[PDB]
Each structure stands twice: as C-alpha cells, then as structure tokens.
C-alpha cells in the first residue's frame, strides 16, 4: 500500500532532468538507467482533457512552441519539440502523456511521485482523468505517491483512490502544519530546503510524518540536510546526490 | 466603502498598476494608474523575509528587480536596496519594491480602490494574510472599496476568518464545473479567470446566481468590448487607460 514505506533518500526532480529534458521520456529513461528509485513528474491536463506531463503553464521554456498547454489539443502538443531546448540530440522528444510515462518508469521498476498540478479549477477533471489512467496501466506491485501545493487536488486524489499515499507540497512549513496534514490525510510534508529548520522537522517526524526537500542540487548540503532527518531530496542531479551517499 | 467592494467594481482595473507603460507594482505604476483616471488597481502582495507585506509578483527576484533570490527569505532592508524599475526605463531608475503601507499611501491619495491579490509563500498563508490585515485594518481608507482575491486556498479561508467584511475573489484560470460549490465554500462574491477560459454560458450562470465575473489579463480592447457585451464585468489590463477609452468611445 503507501508508497512512504518505500521511500527512497533520492528522487529524480522531473526526471534526471539535470542532463535530460525535464519531464520527458528522456529524462525518465535516463533517471530509470542511472539507478534512480523514484521519479518525480508533473501531470496537467491538454486542451483536450488528456493527462500530460509538464511543469509550466506556458509552452514557451521547454518546448519551440507558444501558448498556455492548458488550451492546447493534444495532437498540436505532439509535434512540438520538447527537447532541443535542453540539447539538440533530444529533439525527437515530445510532451509525453502520462500514460507514456508510466510505460518507461515501470520499465525500470521505478517508484513514482506524481506531482498533480492542475490547470487552477481544473483540479477535479485533472485528478478524476489521471486516477482513470493509473488504475488500469501502474502496476500494483511499484510505489505510486500523489502530492501536491493545491488543496482541491488533494482533496480531489482522497475522494477518487484514498488508498493512494499523498504528500502535501509547501514552500514553507505550516506553523499549522499538524491540523492540514491531519485534515488532508497526508503522511508527508514536501518542503522547500530553503525553509527547511531542523527543530521542526524533528517535531514532524516526532509526530510521524515523512519529510522531503525540493530541489536540491548541492551534494553538501543534500548529506547535511539527512543528517538533520530529511527523508529524502527531489533532484536534478540524483545520480551525484547518490554517489554523495554512498561515499 | 471599503466592504461589499463588488458593489463599486469598475469595468477597468490597472494589472499591477498601469503595467504597461510602468513597471509592475510600483509606486509608478500605481501613480500611473491614478494620473490616468483609473478607478481600481490591482497589485500583488507577501511577506518579506522579515515579515513585512510587501508588493511584488514572483517568487525570485531576478526579472523585475537588479537582486536574485527569494524574495520571501530576503529582509525588507536589503529588498529596498534593489532597482525595480530599470528594467522597464532607465526612468524608473529609483522605483523600489513597494510596502503594502507604501503602496495604500499612494493608491489612497487617488481615491481608487484595490483590489489586492494575495500571493502569499506557500505554507505561510496564515501570517502573510494576518500582517497583511493589521496594515490595511490601520491604514485603509474606510471609504474606498477593498477587495480580497487569491488562487491559493488557504489565503482566502485566512481572509474570511480574520477579517470576513472585506469582500472576497477566487481566482483562477479555468471556470471550475463545480463554480458554485467553490464560491460558497469560499464565501466569495466574484470569480477571476484567465481570459482564455471566457465560456459565455458558464459565466451567465454565474452572473445570474449573484456572482461577479472578472478576467484578466486583457490589453486588447476589441476583445474587452467582446467580453462586456458578453456579461463580463471588469478586466485586469496592463494598459488600462486604453481599455477605458474603446469603452468611452464605442458607438
Ligand atoms: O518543481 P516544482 O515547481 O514542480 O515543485 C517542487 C517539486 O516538484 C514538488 O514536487
Ligand atoms: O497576474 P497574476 O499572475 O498575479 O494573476 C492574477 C491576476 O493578477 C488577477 O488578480
Ligand atoms: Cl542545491
Ligand atoms: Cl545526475
Ligand atoms: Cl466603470
Ligand atoms: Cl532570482
Ligand atoms: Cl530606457
Ligand atoms: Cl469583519
Ligand atoms: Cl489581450
Ligand atoms: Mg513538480
Ligand atoms: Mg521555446
Ligand atoms: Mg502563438
Ligand atoms: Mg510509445
Ligand atoms: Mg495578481
Ligand atoms: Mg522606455
Ligand atoms: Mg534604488
Ligand atoms: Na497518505
Ligand atoms: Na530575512
Ligand atoms: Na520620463
Ligand atoms: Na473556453
Ligand atoms: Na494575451
Ligand atoms: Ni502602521
């Protein structure tokens, strides 16, 4: 059951996105091929309603296109260029939908930390099309972690699958942080390591919860960050993070 | 006054002051917006790292200022040490990063309304609203409308239970199909979507159930005049003063 049971130190931040296009097929494959336990990625619906995987609202940064991907219809996605930005041997590679993703990550018996990042008042079509996807093409058998920074979303992903463990994303920690996770029946805090504060990280893991840390790219400080109980970091360079490690 | 703001909506609000010729949540921006006759602004507001609202739109410092960084982990101090405006005109040379304080003081002296967005740091949602209320319950004008408005959840659950007379909006991009359990849920008055997601029906629906419906951001004012006539009742533009004109104009 919860994916937290399984919760490896080190998550590929959008995939190996350091080296890869991040959230793409490539960056899967290379986060699966470097030994990396766990991905994390973003999934959104396209103008069509079908769950996709990308970070912005705009099409701009990571692709050769123009628009909001929100407005955009699948089939216009797919043959942008989602690669070339990041390096031109990557310019084969598209938007992928999240069920093509799940087909790479499970190739390599990777755990997955889907980030639900709605279209904001998209949040129940967003949940209800990528529970459908996932229900019938993850496999039971790998961790699936959901997490978010919007509330609906998360109250959304209880409602459809409860049984799927769920990760709240702030950037800083809630002084109410005990009543939220309580209320939105999380088992972890994903926190951003520049609000990252030892005693209370030491009070949530008191009270039993799994803390995490986005983005961390400096192996110092991921090693300083565990060493003062952070369960585990998203990273663009997870493979260095883990050289660190076993060091 | 400054509650039941809705009632004093007008069809034009300055997007961050008048934006497009000032840069964005300044004081020129905001004098901008006054001098040009505009009713209402719109501005964005978090905390510093040391706690105090301040009026600013991103979460790193790097596109409209000369700093980098966090602007929620930099002291009010240091933030005022950067150029904000330079990077519109070298004639916005001195503008600064606007306290909340700063910018009621200049939106005031116009007798415009604000309708201020709360963007707060994520996870701080509580205390950006609080320190956020303390200044505007000291310095408002009780005779200038106020509105509240967010995308984030928590900002606007903080919003009606520290201070529930002030008006509140959700924003968002898309309609929700479920509008009407959101806005009661919120106890909000007006939805603010992205323009793009203009779906005349859903926004007759929700203009006929009481609700007000606002789009942003809009500097075409062939469109403005589209959406109007389509029930729309006000736009966030970045060029106010020309949206106001096509309106003035129309015959
Ligand atoms: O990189 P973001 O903006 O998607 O947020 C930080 C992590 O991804 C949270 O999962
Ligand atoms: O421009 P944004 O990103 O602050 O979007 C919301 C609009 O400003 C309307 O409040
Ligand atoms: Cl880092
Ligand atoms: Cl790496
Ligand atoms: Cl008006
Ligand atoms: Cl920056
Ligand atoms: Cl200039
Ligand atoms: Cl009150
Ligand atoms: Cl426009
Ligand atoms: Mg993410
Ligand atoms: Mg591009
Ligand atoms: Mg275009
Ligand atoms: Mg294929
Ligand atoms: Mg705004
Ligand atoms: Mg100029
Ligand atoms: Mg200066
Ligand atoms: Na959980
Ligand atoms: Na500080
Ligand atoms: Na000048
Ligand atoms: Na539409
Ligand atoms: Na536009
Ligand atoms: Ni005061």
Request: proline share 4%.
């Amino acid at each position: 059951q919860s994916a937290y049971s399984f919760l490896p130190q080190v998550i590929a931040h959008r995939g190996s996105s350091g080296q890869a296009p991040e959230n793409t097929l490539a960056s899967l494959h290379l986060a699966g091929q470097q030994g990396i336990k766990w991905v994390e990625i973003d999934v959104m619906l396209s103008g069509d309603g079908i769950p996709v995987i990308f970070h912005d609202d705009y099409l701009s940064r990571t692709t050769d296109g123009d628009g909001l991907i929100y407005k955009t219809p699948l089939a216009e996605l797919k043959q942008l260029d989602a690669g070339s930005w990041k390096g031109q041997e990557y310019q084969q590679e598209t938007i992928p939908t999240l069920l093509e993703a799940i087909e790479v990550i499970s190739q390599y018996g990777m755990g997955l930390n889907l980030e639900l990042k709605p279209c904001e008042g998209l949040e129940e079509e967003t949940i209800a099309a990528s529970v459908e996807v996932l229900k019938q093409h993850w496999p039971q058998d790998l961790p699936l972690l959901f997490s978010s920074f919007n509330y609906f979303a998360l109250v959304s992903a209880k409602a459809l699958w409860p049984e799927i463990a769920r990760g709240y994303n702030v950037s800083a920690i809630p002084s109410a942080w005990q009543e939220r996770l309580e209320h939105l029946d999380c088992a972890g805090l994903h926190i951003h390591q520049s609000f990252f504060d030892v005693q209370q990280v030491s009070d949530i893991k008191a009270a039993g919860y799994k803390v995490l840390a986005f983005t961390i790219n400096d192996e110092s400080l991921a090693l300083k960050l565990y060493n003062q109980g952070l369960d585990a970091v998203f990273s663009d360079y997870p493979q260095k993070i883990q050289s660190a490690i076993d060091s």
